[PDB]
Structure 1
């Protein structure tokens, strides 16, 4: 270990979610995107933009800030313009901005939870022409993809689905080595 001892130490803190926690969050995230859809529908902005803005706002309340493989930013002006157009929106909407806020907050917490998983899985793949942290970034990137596509009402534990994407991720990764 090195300056990544710091990372592991950062994540080892975050306690695992119980099942009911997992669900409630996953509901919030799902509901968040649904809102963000209605919002993209009214303000005719990109759905992925709107989120990205909302996320960069509530990223303040996050338990982990510098997460490998995840995508930072974006830009304070667009944040500013977009949020401007958003907050200034009508009052009957309002509710939707709250939900969208909650969802993205959820997603952040969810991902924070599962960072320990990515690391445990990642260990399995050392010695394949990626340095540890590479794995961790690819790992995290899969985990983010995982949360994106996860449907909770399938009654499967998150770790199962997450594991699949975390492995798909690192596997495709080392395949792009050739």
Structure 2
């Protein structure tokens, strides 16, 4: 039974107290604004850096190769923007990390509310 399977799977991840909720939301918004600030940093779009960070987060090679056979090349347009964002001073860097953490928080929030 698939229903049993999924229901148990979401039964694994616990709920979220008001503290956790507010904190996660905060971290998410901080992440987004960090992406915008990075858009003012290297001069690239929000969803660009966003999807790059995701590609570094919710899976290594699996986000690229199968949303259909053709999207944005793995060694080429992913890694070069990665390395381009790698080559920045300290503040933009800490904002990169912050952005990533924001993404993760988004994921968890999504789960409880699943």
Question: Does TM, scored on the shorter chain, surpass 0.5?
Answer: yes
Unaligned runs of 5+ in 2: none
Unaligned runs of 5+ in 1: 115-178
Partner of 1:168 in structure 2?
A: none
Q: CA deviation at 1:63?
A: 16
Q: CA deviation at 1:24?
A: 0.3
Q: How many residues align?
A: 113
TM-score normalized by structure 1?
0.51
- The 1:31/1:6 distance shift into structure 2, 3 A limit, reads same
Q: Which stretch has the larger CA shift, 99-108 or 23-32?
A: 99-108
Q: CA deviation at 1:77?
A: 3.9
- Separation in 1, partners of 2:66, 2:110: 10
Q: CA deviation at 1:34?
A: 0.5
Larger relative contact order (C-alpha < 8 A, sep ≥ 6)? 2
- Separation in 2, partners of 1:112, 1:70: 28
Q: Which stretch has the larger CA shift, 43-52 or 2-11?
A: 2-11
Maintained 8 Å contact 1:64/1:112: no
Larger Rg: 1
SS of equivalent residue, structure 1 residue 72: coil
Maintained 8 Å contact 1:36/1:50: yes
- The 1:67/1:79 distance shift into structure 2, 3 A limit, reads closer
- Separation in 2, partners of 1:92, 1:52: 21
Residues 86-134 of structure 1: CA deviation (Å, up to 9, x unaligned): 11222342121121111111111111221xxxxxxxxxxxxxxxxxxxx
TM-score normalized by structure 2?
0.75
SS of equivalent residue, structure 1 residue 26: helix
